[PDB]
Symmetry: C3
């Protein structure tokens, strides 16, 4: 994939092109079980040091089970309810009588198994930890008599190792009110996640996509606590299904565009708004305004469409003609005599104003470019850093082609006397009507 960039001198904005989409549009739920031991406290006149270590680890196991129980007695509402109704439907199905027995029977001989629940959902279940078998076979002979049997020291170490995953899963589920994201290796080991991906009802390119980007998959997944019932701890892992794949995506970068008069109080400014990620999606454009909601890897963007707005494809014409009548290109006009810079995919936009010292350097050649007052741009070819005032930024050294599209700054087309300055959420046509209305009060006068 070839990454290219285009700087528009007329609007002080840049577009980084050539990116491929992977937008989340669906969910795949899966049940993760941990087999627990329904045991009660036994005291057996025990004092041997190995028995003490075992009972200590057993009390940490009992407190972990009761803590998970108080999590299902009262579950605090979360801000994620608009994205977890699928996993929640699976957890509500699990509360029916006989359904946990159903997954418990299917996982009697194997760790993984497909189970058709009583709500029409054919989920993939697995058993990642078996504490009922371990406690009842290796531990119960110790606390289960008049005097305690002595366990070997290997059992003490193996049980602290096995019980550890229960304690960390209980910690993540406890602090997050039963809904965690991202999904940690405690909730699902990388081996278990990759094995779950291979067994999903998805295409082979989608298994290769999710398997090569497991950390992004984890960051776009949810782990939801279901129930502790009948010696079973069940929780749902909700994994993303990327319904939009390989559609063009581009990132818009914007910076203030002011006039450069030498007398303060006579300058006006404008800045394009709605900078962020754009991806073609189903005849429209999916826009991602928050900056961290889209993870980038090698020219592929992984977004969740729940963090998007749906815009007409004509929004791209703000990049080709900001004065274009098919879409009303949005701007803001607060004045700004302060310098700033934006590091793009293949270069840097610099808005230099006032007395600020703006420059672009190469590590071994020194200063190779000095920006004048106004908005300018430099590619990463031969440039390592950009300095604005007392701040030094690093330019991304990724390969690609930049194109400097020369053009007159549109802020110069505006009469300062009637310019509407201080517009927070405006548009090109909004500014033009405010100019026609301020010009009519002078036309009559």
């Amino acid at each position: 994939q070839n990454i290219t960039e285009e700087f528009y001198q007329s609007t002080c904005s840049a577009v980084s092109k050539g990116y491929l989409s992977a937008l989340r549009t669906g969910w795949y739920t899966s049940v993760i079980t941990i087999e627990l031991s329904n045991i009660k406290e036994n005291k057996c006149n025990g004092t041997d040091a190995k028995v003490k270590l075992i009972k200590q680890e057993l009390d940490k196991y009992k407190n972990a089970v009761t803590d998970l129980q108080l999590l299902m007695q009262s579950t605090p509402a979360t801000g994620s309810g608009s994205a977890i109704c699928s996993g929640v439907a699976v957890c509500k199905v699990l509360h029916l009588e006989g359904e946990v027995n159903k997954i418990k029977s299917a996982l009697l001989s194997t760790n993984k198994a497909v189970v058709s629940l009583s709500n029409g959902v054919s989920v993939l279940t697995s058993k990642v930890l078996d504490l009922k078998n371990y406690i009842d076979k290796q531990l119960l002979p110790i606390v289960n008599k008049q005097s305690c049997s002595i366990p070997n020291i290997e059992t003490v170490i193996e049980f602290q190792q096995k019980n550890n995953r229960l304690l960390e899963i209980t910690r993540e589920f406890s602090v997050n009110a039963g809904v965690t994201t991202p999904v940690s290796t405690y909730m699902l080991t990388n081996s278990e996640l990759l094995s779950l991906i291979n067994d999903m009802p998805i295409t082979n390119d989608q298994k290769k996509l999710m398997s090569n980007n497991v950390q992004i998959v984890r960051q776009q997944s949810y782990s939801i606590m279901c129930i502790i019932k009948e010696e079973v701890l069940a929780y749902v892992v909700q994994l993303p299904l990327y319904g939009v794949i390989d559609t063009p995506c581009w990132k818009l970068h914007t910076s203030p565009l002011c006039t450069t008069n030498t007398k303060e109080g006579s300058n006006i400014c404008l800045t394009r708004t709605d900078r962020g990620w754009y991806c073609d999606n189903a005849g429209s454009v999916s826009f991602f305004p928050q900056a961290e909601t889209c993870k980038v890897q090698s020219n592929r963007v992984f977004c969740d469409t729940m963090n998007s707005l749906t815009l007409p494809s004509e929004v791209n014409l703000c990049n080709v003609d900001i004065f274009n009548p098919k879409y009303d290109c949005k701007i803001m006009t607060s004045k700004t005599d302060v310098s700033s810079s934006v590091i793009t995919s293949l270069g840097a936009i610099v808005s230099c104003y006032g007395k600020t010292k703006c420059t672009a350097s190469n590590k071994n050649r020194g200063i190779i470019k000095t920006f004048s007052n106004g908005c300018d741009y430099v590619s990463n070819k031969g440039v390592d850093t950009v300095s604005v005032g007392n701040t030094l930024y690093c330019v991304n050294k990724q390969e690609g082609k930049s194109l400097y599209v020369k053009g007159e700054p549109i802020i110069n087309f505006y009469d300062p006397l009637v310019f509407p300055s201080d517009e927070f959420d405006a548009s090109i046509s909004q500014v033009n009507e405010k100019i026609n209305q301020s010009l009519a009060f002078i036309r009559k006068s």
Copy 2:
């Protein structure tokens, strides 16, 4: 508790009612001690593998103590100073000579004990870990001679388990400059927190409230590091006292209300501001503008009044008459031809504009409602999801009654030519004076 909701078609806003408050108004401080061992390094010609393991764990203990020491030599200021003066007053009292000896003497025979400090505060102290007794009884005979004694392997495991809590407490206190929130199970185990709640000078309903919502209590608590002095590590846990209980609380949801003309550039919009949580409090209303500052459980809201504004109770009349002269109902008027949705407690508000495809579906019946252009609403009765453009939201399936309050959208009462569009922080009366002022320039002309 019955949750109800009301959608106001006239203002594109909804109010979710029926919630009970629990607002934090006071603090209960408590001292948590860890008994340390004032020991120095001893080298004893040791090479046996068990001795090596013990000295390794002992060096991790010494580095944890010196790290806590450099935390009290220089404590970085935190953004939490406006909420921890109570716990800080207890830590400053502890620095007096003889006060740490006082808590150290009261906890000579028991783990928990009430102590009257020299500043008039009767605090509940406890001793959650005893490393001085363990190191001096089980470890000192090993490093304390010409040649080292051999410890049994159970001691090596028990000491790594005991020293672990010191290392994790030191890690949380080190990365957070001595002030951590929420309070982790390392700072205070769930068993210790519940035991502390039972012993507090609070009513039995307040102990039941805090004990049934321990994770919310932890998230609204602070752990403050006090001192390492004379073989004692002391830190304060500051727990919330919920002075406002069972007062009505409601959540306001707002969405843009535009006109739906078919020609772009001729539409105006308004949006109610100050969406969030409202609770009746002491003759006024406590408003919570940040969304995540109030945790919800089963119809109970748990807020910290430090994240609130105090408003007159007439602010509720924006929900009954936005044109009401007792309170100046605030709005913003930026234009917005972009569609959006808000998931409420019992349904969903949809602002559909332009060509956006807005719908509400049931999982098995399909699309059951198509929104027209404008602001509309649908209850969760029979609805599972809402789709706006390329985005699908899940509707909360909580039981309650919704009421659709029909009314003419107030944006239709405004002449577009003189509407003040692009108002960031405005009000209904603010907009009306700007309309009277723009109408006077035309009245004379």
Copy 3:
């Protein structure tokens, strides 16, 4: 250092003076190596409990190595690229053939060593964990034959302890796409960080500065994953170099300034903008608008100049004469009949409006000051808390001198009829031109 404060009654703002700077201007990169064992799976008819524990820990080691391998096959782009080009240049140099052999040879006999890479960077390398020596000397004799040798139980415990740091480093590098900040004790122990500081090519006062503020140094550092190659795991720790030291720094606090007419709808307001941290820097002022980007210790501020704007030193004259022609003092004018408070370094600003009950109390004397309507201030001398409505704030009890600079509130100099209210990003001169333009439409009429 003497901390002083100045409240300006005329503009409802305060300046906390007397702070010394430490601004980050450069980076010092360092290579951290972990010697790994290139081993493949061996199965040896083993069933003894100690052998099982060892093979389990060995599988967790192999999955940690393959997980780090999939992190270097595909590295997701991060939002930190503008600040890590130095460490990234070191990681790219490491990918050259023979360069990892170079650091591997220099660290053949010692843990720490200076290495001149093939890109002109003289970095300090160290070897914090040696798993190749441990696995090949203590573990290989177990899995390396027809039947497995039996390890002693001390080896099982020592290997779980040693392998633990690899698993936690792999976890932090996995969830963060190879770039972590702050730098944890797993990436670099406090002992290793202090040893690295002592060996840096910096002055003795800078080593004392960074050694006394290690947690702030960690929070302003980066750990970047380099490569797993030829039995070596290498990653770069990028530590801050504080190029600006002991320059004056001050913190500006602002609060709304309204008129106090008794009839709602007749009041206007203004609020100074650009509250935050200011530090003198290289003939200009470095301004830090985000509040948490500057850590404060004992009168020293530690900022990263990447989170700053560069302003002329005349910006300080907004504190002495807001009407001063050398710098256009910025304000916003949204109306606000809501009360609020700002806790400063030595007191509290209170903006009391409407019916709000504002007061300042001492813990033992009770209410000692009642604020009237308007903007006022109280020092921390004798004051413990400030209550505004239903909210109680704690006043910082730090010693210093406050100065109450009396003056007429400038909002009273404005005619309400022509005031531009609802200005989002304005200035004193911006407001004056809007008043001259609204007065010209009345002058002719």
